[PDB]
């Protein structure tokens, strides 16, 4: 298997090609390996930024809201994430 940072780079590669499904596959793997305590340069908050947008593109509304909340929890001055959270709470009334 690949390293956490290799998987992250695979996910960013897919995102930059506009391939949101494969972004989700790679970034879910990154989060899994980070929860296994594997060493890595990438932070959880950076992974959640790509993942939350990618799952929204795929149509997964409450999951995108959940992940955006998690992103803001770990990076409170992230203004774009705060803007995303306001969008999803207004859209989903939650």
């Amino acid at each position: 298997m690949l390293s956490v940072d290799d998987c992250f780079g695979m996910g960013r590669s897919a995102y930059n090609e506009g391939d949101y499904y494969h972004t989700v596959l790679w970034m879910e793997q990154v989060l899994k390996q980070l929860d296994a305590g594997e060493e890595a340069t990438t932070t959880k908050s950076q992974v959640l930024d790509y993942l939350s947008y990618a799952v929204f593109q795929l149509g997964d509304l409450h999951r995108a809201l959940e992940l955006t909340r998690r992103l803001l929890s770990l990076d409170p001055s992230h203004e774009r994430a705060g803007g995303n959270l306001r969008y999803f709470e207004q859209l989903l009334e939650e």
């Binding site: 995102y15 930024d49 947008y53």
Partner: peptide, 8 residues
Amino acid sequence: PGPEGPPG
């Protein structure tokens, strides 16, 4: 609109 993802 609308959520905004990472620039790159």
